[PDB]
Structures are given as C-alpha cells and as structure tokens.
Amino acid sequence: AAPAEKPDPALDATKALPKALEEVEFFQSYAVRRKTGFHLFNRATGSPTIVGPMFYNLYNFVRIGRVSKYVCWLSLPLVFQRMWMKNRATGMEYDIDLENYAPFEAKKNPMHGH
Amino acid sequence: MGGKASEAVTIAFRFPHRTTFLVKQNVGQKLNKGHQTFWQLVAGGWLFFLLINRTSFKPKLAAPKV
Amino acid sequence: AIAYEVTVNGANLIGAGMAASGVGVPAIGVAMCFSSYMLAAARQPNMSAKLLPYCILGFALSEALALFTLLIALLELFVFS
Amino acid sequence: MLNSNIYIIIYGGIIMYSIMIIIQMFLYNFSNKIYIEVEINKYILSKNNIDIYWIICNCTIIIIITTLNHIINKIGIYNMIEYNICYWLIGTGLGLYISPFIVFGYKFFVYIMDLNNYSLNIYHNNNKMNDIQQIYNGTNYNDTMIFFIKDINNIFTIYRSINFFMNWLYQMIYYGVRMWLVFVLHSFSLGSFGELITVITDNNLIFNVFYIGLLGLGFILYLIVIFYLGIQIYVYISFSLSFLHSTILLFLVNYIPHYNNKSIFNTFTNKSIY
Amino acid sequence: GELSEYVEVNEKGMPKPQALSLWNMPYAKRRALTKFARGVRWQFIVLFIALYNFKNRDDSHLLRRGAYN
Amino acid sequence: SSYTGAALAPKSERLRLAFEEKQKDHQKCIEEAKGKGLKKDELIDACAWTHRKTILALKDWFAYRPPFQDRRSKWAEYCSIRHDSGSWLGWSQKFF
Amino acid sequence: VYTNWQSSYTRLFVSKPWMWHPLAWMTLSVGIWWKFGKESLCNERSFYIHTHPKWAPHKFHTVYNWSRDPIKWTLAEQYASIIRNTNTDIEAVLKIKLPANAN
Amino acid sequence: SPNEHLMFFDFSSWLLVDFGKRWERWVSFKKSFLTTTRSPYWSPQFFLLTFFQLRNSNVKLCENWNWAPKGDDFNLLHNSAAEPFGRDLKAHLEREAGAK
Amino acid sequence: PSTSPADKDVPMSILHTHGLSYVNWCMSLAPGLLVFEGFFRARYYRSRVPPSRTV
Amino acid sequence: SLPTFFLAPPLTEPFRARHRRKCIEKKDTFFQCLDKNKNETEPCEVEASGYSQECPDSWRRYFNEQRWKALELKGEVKHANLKNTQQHF
Amino acid sequence: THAELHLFDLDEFMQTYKRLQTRQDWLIENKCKKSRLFSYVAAVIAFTVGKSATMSDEAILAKIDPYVTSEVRVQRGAWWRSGYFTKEEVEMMTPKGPIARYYKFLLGVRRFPLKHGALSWACGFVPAWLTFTSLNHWAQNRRLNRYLTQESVFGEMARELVRGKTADEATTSVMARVEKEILGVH
Amino acid sequence: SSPLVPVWNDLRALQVFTSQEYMQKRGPGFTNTLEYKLSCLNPVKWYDMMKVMPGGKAFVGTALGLALFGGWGVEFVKNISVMTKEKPPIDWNNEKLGHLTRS
C-alpha cells in the first residue's frame, strides 16, 4: 500500500538488442574476404543470390572448428547411398506372387490387423 | 475455468488481526480446588472400561478335537 | 422399426478439408500483431524495446489457435481407419 | 497359481541418459538465475522468496537442458522426450504446479480450511452483529437447516475453497499441452514437407542436387528451429510465472508500513504493574 | 477489483452498490425474500436435479422380480 | 437397433460361463497335445496360456461375492442407487 | 565452522523447502502411476492393449504381429516355468464344476 | 520418417514383477521382523506395519454392494432383441420353415 | 526368468541402410554444430585480448 | 441424500404408480390387439404408439420377453429368440 | 501380540475366496468394524481427559472464554471496549458442548498443571494411543476366536493356521476340501 | 469468472445485513427464548460454532464433516447418474455355499 519505489534501471530494456547486434556484427566480421580468388555465380539477371555470399562466413567458422569439421561429414556418404539405392528400387523386378501375398505396408491386410 | 487470486480476498485480509497478550490480576480464583480424589476414580473407571472390553486370545479353541 | 447401420468411410477425409479451410483464418490476425509493433515503433522508436515482449507475446498466442485448428485434421487421418 | 498376480513393466535406456542431464547442470551453472530473480522480485516480496526461486530455477534449467539435448544430443529418449505428453504434463508442469503449495503451503492450507467456514468478507468490519453471527451461527449467512444437506455441503464448500486455486492447474495443463502440440505438429509438418520435396527430386534427378547448398539450408533450418523453440520456451516460462503471480501470489500481498519505535531502552512488563 | 464474496462499507455502515442497488425496497420485502435464502446456490440446483432423477428413477429390476404384479 | 442398458446375466452366471468357456478352450488344447503325442513338460509349454486363463476366470469367480440381503440393501434397491450396505461412512470408510 | 552443507544432508534437506520439492514430485508421479497406469497398462490382464493401433501406435516399431504373438509365447514360457517350479497339475483345473447362485 | 523420429524404440527388456509374490514376501518379512523383535501390539512399528493392512482388508470384506460398478454391470451397449410381433416373428417363422 | 533370445541377434551391415536425403541431412543439424562450434570457440578465445605494442 | 432417500419416495409414490398402471393398461390392450390380429402390428398402430410412448424401454423389453415365452407356451413358436435378453431367475 | 500375523494370511485367503464368505463371517467383520470405529472416539475422549489432567486454568479458559474462541473473526478492540458485548451476548458466544461443560466443571477441580507443550500433549496421547491399540488388538483377537469357533471354510483355514502350519500348505489343504465337498470335483 | 460477481455480492450483502437488521430489531432477550435453549443442547450448533474456533478446529471440523457425511455425499453424486439408468435384478446370495464341517 503506497510503497513509493523509485525506478530501477536494471529492469529496463536498452541493451538486449544492442548486444544481439554486437553478436551479429561479430559473426559478419568473419565474412570479410579478399578480392583474389573471389567468384560467385549470380542469378540469370546478374543479381546476387541469397545463400551464395553467406557461405564464406560459415566455412570460415568451420575452419576454426576442431572436431565437427572432421566428424560431421561422415554422414554425407549416406546421402549418396540413398541416391543410389532409390534408383535401384524405382525399377526393381519382383515376383508377382510374392507381391500379391506380402505387399509392404498395404491397407486392409488382415495379417497386419486391419 | 476456475477462479483466481485477483478475484478473491487475501491471506492478509482474512486473518488481519495480530497478536495481543491478555493478562488478568490474581484475585485468588485458582485456589481451594476441590475434588481431590477425582483422578483416582477417573483412572479406575478407565481401567474398568479396558477390563470389560478386554479379550484374551484363546487358541485352544482351535485344538483338533475331531 | 428397421435399423440400418452405415459406416461412411469418406467422412474420414472430407472433414480433413473442412478443417483445412479454417487453418488460415488466424494468419490475418497473426500479422496484425507485427504490423501494430511496426507502426507503434514508428510512432516511438524508444518504446520498441518495451513493446517487443508484447509483440512476441502477441504472435505465439495468435499462432497457437491455427495450430489447434491444424491438430484435428491431422488427428482425423493418421489414427482413424 | 492363483496368488501370483503378474505385472509387466517396460524398461529402456534411462540411467546413462538421466545422469548427463544432471552432470550438465555444473556446466550451465544456472544461467537463468538472474531472470528468475528479477521476475520473483517483481511478483512477490517475502522471506520465502529464495525457496520458490530455487525451485523455478531447477525446473527451468531442466527444461532448457532437455531441449538442447533434444536439438543437439539426438539419441534414444532425448528425441521423444519433448514430443511426449507425459514429460510436458509431469516433468515440467507438475513441479511448477506444486511449487507454491510447497513454499506457502501452510498459509494456503489455513486459508482453505478457513474458507470452508464460508462467510462474507467486509472491509472495515466494525460491525458487532457480524461477529455474533460468525460465532453463534458460524457464518454471516443463514445456516438454518443446512445440516439437513450437510453431506453435499462439505464437498461443495471444499470446491468453493479451492476454486481460486484451480485456474493454476488449468493454465499449467493448457500450456503443457500447448508445448507438446507445438513441438509434435511442427516437427511432423516439417518432416512431411521434406519428404514430399525428396520425392519430387528423386522422381526428377535433374533436381536431386544440393540446390540450396550443403551448409546454407542446414544453417537456416538450425536458426529457424532454435529461434522458434527459444520463443516457445520463453513464452512457456514467462506465462507460467505471470499466471503464477496473477492466480496464486496475489493472495500473499501483506504490506506492513514502517512504524517508528520510541520505548527502546525501556519495556513495560508484568512485573512493572503486578 | 470486483472480488468474490467481498463488499465495501460507507461511513453509515451500509454496503456500497457495486452493480445494483436493492436497498430501496422495504424491510418487510427484504425479510420475505431472505428468510428462505442461504449462502448456497449450486447445491439447491444439484438437489433439484437429483430429485428429478429420483422421480424418474428406473424400477425394471423390481418389475423382473414382481413387485408390481 | 441397440440400447444402453443393464447387463443381461448376473455377474456370478457371467463368470460361471466364462470359466466354462476357458475350460473348453483348455480341454481342446489338451486334447490336441494328446493327439500330437506330447509329454508333460511339452503339454505344459503348450497349454500354459489357457491354464492361466482358466485360473484367472476362477480367481474372478472366487473374488466376486454375491450380495447379502438386508434392510439397507432392500431400501437401496427401492431407491435405485448403487449402495454398499457394509459401510458406516461411505467413501471415507476406504480411509477409515 | 559447522555447516549442514558439509556435515548433515538431513538438516540441509529439512532447512530448505526447495529440497522437498523434488521428493514430493517423485512421490506424486509414482502415486499417479500406481493409481492409473499400473492396472490399466502393466498388468497381465491389461497388457494386450499395447497391440492396439489407436492407443499404442507402433509400440513394437511396426503394427503388432498377431500371427507370431510374442507376448503370448513369452508369457506362456513364463507360466510354464511357474508351473514347473510349483509342480502343479495342468489337468486339475478341468475337473472343476462351479455351481450357480440359484434363486 | 517423421513418425520414426517421433518414435521411441530404445527399450532394452521387460521387467516382470509378481506383485502377489512380492506382497506375500513383504508380509512375511514384516512377520519375521515383528517376531524377531518380539514387539508388542502398542508399538508404532506394529501399528504402522499391521493396522492399515487390517483396515483395508476389513473394508474389502465388509463391502456389500447391491450393484457392481458402472461399466461392469449396466450402462452397456446391447443389440436390440427380436420382437414377438411384426417383422421379427415373420422372419423367425420363415427361418423355422426353411430349416424344417 | 532372464532370457537372451536369438531373435534379437540379427545380421548387420551398413550396405543395407536406406540412408538419408539431402533435406533430412540438413535437418539433422550437423551443419549447425559445424558452424557454431567455431563461432563459440572464436568468441570465447577472442574476448580475452593479450597485451600488445601499437606500431 | 437424506431428503431424496427418506422424504421424496412417499411423495413420488403416487405419481409413479399412476404411470405404472397406465403402462400396464397400454401393455394389456396392445397384446390383446396382437392376439386379435395374429401378432400383426399394422392395424394396432394407435395402440403401438401409445405403448411405445407410455411404457419405457426397460419395461417394453420385459413385456416382449414375456410374450415370447407365452407364444412358446401356446405353441405359436419353438425355441424363441433370446439372444439379447435377461437370463435372470 | 500373535493374532495379527495369522489374520494377515487369513484375510488374504478371504479376499481371494470371498465367494466362500457366509453371513456370520460378514457379521463378525461388521462387529470388528464397529469396534474399530468406536476406538477412535474412545481415543479422542482419553486424549481430552489426559490433556485436561495437565492443562492450567489459562489453557482451559483458552477454550471456554469467547475472547480466545473469537480470535479468528472478531477484533480484540471489541473486547477491550467495555460494554460492547453484553453478558447474555458473551453467554451465547460461549461454547455449549459437553467438552466445554466438562472443562467448566474442571475449573474447580484440583489437578497437576504443567506448561503448555509436549508433556501436556503426551499425557493425553499416551492413554489415547494405548486405548486405540488395545481395543483394536482385542477386537482382532475376538474376531479370530469367532472364526475359530465358526464351522466354515474360513474357520477351518484359521484353525489349520493356528496349529502352526505354513500359509501355502494350509491353502492347499483347504482347497483340497473345497474342490471335493464344496465344488464337487469331477 | 463471470461478470455477475458484483450482483451476487450485492445479494449476499443484502441477506447478511438484513439478518443483522433483524437481530437489531428483535434486540436482546434471545437467550430467554426456546430456540436458544435448544441450540444450547443441539449438536449441530456445537459443531458449527467449533468450526470457527482457533487451534486447527476449522481443519478438524471440515475433516470430521468429510469423514462423516461427505463420503455419503460423494456416493450420492455418483448415484445421481445411476438413478435414471436401467439396472438388472440383484443376484441375492442363496447363503448355501461356504458351510463346511470342522476337522
């Protein structure tokens, strides 16, 4: 009942967005690159892409990593494994009798339950 | 669903009274207490109640008479 | 009297579209919040920090009902036969 | 045999996954402590602040840890635990629900047992007939022939006492279910869009190429996921604490003004008079 | 504000009206209205519902046994 | 058509018929094991399931006591309410 | 200097309601499971509900295989082990004829 | 698959617990403890270890329910029976004629 | 009692794996670890400046 | 509880006894007309509607079972259909 | 201090084979229920009388005088203003129950007062505790004796357990009779 | 909550202050009436005036009311949706099964 509290500056919000912009500026500072060896495929209009000019920053951070740059790529061969096996499976020849007796994940199969 | 504290009185509104210690002069009211043999008879009645409601366990009823 | 039980399996997938029509009606209200935050900061930039909580607060709630509207149509298909 | 009543429990990977959640708490070191301090000092002022503060800190940091392990350390239970309703109702909502009843449980219990003696609350109660009605009849209201229906009266008055503690349970359940639905539906929709795009590209191998980029799409999706989930967790916490305030902690507003003392070096006593 | 089971009082000891004033009617009418009223609302409704279902209770289990023959 | 109403047979008769059905389903397994020429241990591994089902039906039958007749139960029948005529306190007798 | 921090966990627990909170949490969760999930899910009479596609979708990573019935054969092996440990007669149950509560 | 990501198949085994046998062994352990300690009936040990069990057993043996619970003895869905008049009786007679 | 059936023991080989798509790999959030490990390492080890001489 | 189970029943007795009597009357008339018209439900539609309106379902089921038993007794049928019927005693 | 150990297995047997319960067994259980319920009231009475044997006049007037029984609802200033409450008003505010009348009589009774604390409370709790425990123990003894003198299946089980036999052996021995005589084994 | 809360507050204040007005009008002399002399011997009045006493007597009174009457109230609430429902006849026990000679 009527405590008469003065304003506390610690409860204000005048540093969160500046700090976030400081972090983002620290991020974008590592995107600075030299002119030598520079190449970027622009769009057909000649205008730049979106993701294109922000690959150097990501790979400059990958440069500074220690373990992820030597581990996180080992899941990438698995993508080509799928690319190959999918194409093998798009046209795989199978037995008609076995397909009619044991269709995979087909509906109204009483052996499954429904 | 349900009510809130904003829609009700507080724990300070209820129980708003702080403590006050009452004292009274001694005129001699707690003197000449009678019934000097009250607790003896009370204990006797209590033990009597326990005795009438006592029941010893008699397992000999389960003896194989048959 | 006579009694014919019928099980209409098409209503499994009709109601999915009937609920799907309503999933976008919150979106016009969702964008109202950020439009308000924009114009309020345009009136007073210094207040943009104190209203931004009410901006985020205004989105996730308005967005939620859309999600709840989206739940039934997804509750309608992947469990019912 | 007849006496053998057999029960089957389903046991999985629990021990080694639960140990690291606690071991990480030394690394995080309660980074949310300042935020929860600020909010608690906004919403309540009492000696038992530290208790509720510590409780909320534990709950929130556990939520944060589980979320980060759900985003990064993807193994076994860490993926399902945020997509499951039992975690969102009992591992986050129940603790926040029982926290004020564990800190201020004495006062709330006494309040409830006094509200079972339901009565009209008068401001500046300088009335005498109110006191006689409250003592003799038990209540301000007319209690004539309510013993005739006492069997229902008890339980109804009990609900009448906890009705202003029930919306807290309702809001906790609502926001737990909300977080569960958010996580589940957003994950499912995103995966579905991914699968449809992969079907289009597998059927058109001119497009089965890293068409956005190997790291661009991944970085963008990482940012999208973490930004969205951070917004949702901040919402769930801020709303949980604001509703805690507005529903349970306004009961405990007891402002005492400061009264200057005068008889410091001398105190009247029973021996001063008698 | 507008709390539950709460009422303010003025200098004359009278309840201040929050929404509606009902102190114009005479004391006889007020006593007539309030002699049968209580501090309980929903229990009477539940009791009337129970009495309706008791009036409309089932007695088939007695018909099978022959209490109505 | 259909209707939501009372159970047809009493609980005791229902459990009796269930026990008879499980007796039949166990006897059939036993007869099949005998026709196949199984020993005791193989007959056990064969028909342990139906044996347990029969034992559970027997447990249900032994667990259900039909009610005793008294003035309180008859008054509860007249009132058409589910009532326990063995409790002085009702729902609190569970905790008292 | 004496501290319950380093010399008594009991007095530390007693002097801090925020240490009572996890214990009450544990007790309430276990009581909830005991009241609701125990008999409805974990009991042998109520364990086949995990084969339901609506109430337990893909509890076995697939739709439940009813031709195989792993639950049936596991529990049958366990009941057989119980029967062999107790030396109970299989055919003694079939010699029973329960009466009916006549009248 | 997305549901495959929303699935938890990291189980290890099934813990089977005969709660009847465990309750029996608990009661046996209580009896053994009370006999070894030779504790009287007025002890808090004896009270805590005996009274609640006896109370719950006495209640479960005193219970005399005129009717069984809701979803076990009534309020059950039942197909409508055949009537002894109209179309059902005609169908019954036609069935009897065709069978015989 | 405790059991260890042979049904759980099955053949294993990485050749039989279907694998992942490009989209699923991007959603696996490995590339985010790849970037943000270096980001946070850089921030931590760049906050602490050493002494120097201005030339 | 106390009013509903110790004061209500003597007040609700006649209102229910009249309904019981009317249902028994409609039952008797309906089955009389069925005995007349050889168990045909086409002519006695007014009495069928009155029977369905006044008598409740739980009473109608018992009356149908009783008429099935009666037809078994008088030989109109044999092995009456008792699929969903109370097999009490 | 020995009947409860047998009554445990007997109660498990009765719960399992509850179908075999007679009306006389039901009445025995109902009598045990009656004794259990009256033991609470006897414990309350013993607690009151014991604490009242160690309560001072101030502790008693705390329960009689409406100044103390009105601390929840009424301001203390209403009692400090002389003439606010009349004599009849104070009389209607005083408690009228039998405990209040007992304490009113006990004002003029000599006793052995103690300071309000754990000993004044233990002097009531101990007689109440002994009363409750002894009444329940003797009730269970009476129940077991009635079962032993009861010519029924539960009586036979209780007898066989009182001989000194194991629970499993007694269950088997009694079920061998149930299958033959009661169930009519094939 | 509803917006009728101030309406209900006005009605509660009406009945309360009218009862107090009635008590003021009738004035002293209530202790000489027969109603008071019966309430002095009425257990309902004892319980009702013990509820508001201090020393945990509110909790005692509420729990006593629960243990005595609230269980029957819970049963009554459960039976409200049972009175209208079709129930079967009670399978009264023949009281023949259980008798067995001692040996």
Ligand SMILES: CCCCCCCCCCCCO[C@@H]1O[C@H](CO)[C@@H](O[C@H]2O[C@H](CO)[C@@H](O)[C@H](O)[C@H]2O)[C@H](O)[C@H]1O
């Ligand atoms: C500010 C952005 C606003 C737009 C909001 C867009 C919605 C974003 C929702 C983000 C939450 C989705 O949550 C995320 O779901 C994906 C998709 O399954 C999960 O991803 C996981 O499942 C997919 C599905 O195949 C696998 O391919 C992948 O390898 C695995 O990581 C993430 O582990 C989870 O964190």
Ligand SMILES: COCCOCCOCCOc1ccc(C(C)(C)CC(C)(C)C)cc1
């Ligand atoms: C922890 O949160 C910090 C994450 O911040 C990530 C921000 O992501 C955007 C960075 O991507 C860009 C975008 C644009 C650019 C450059 C292309 C600004 C434009 C330039 C170099 C041509 C001027 C560089 C990087």
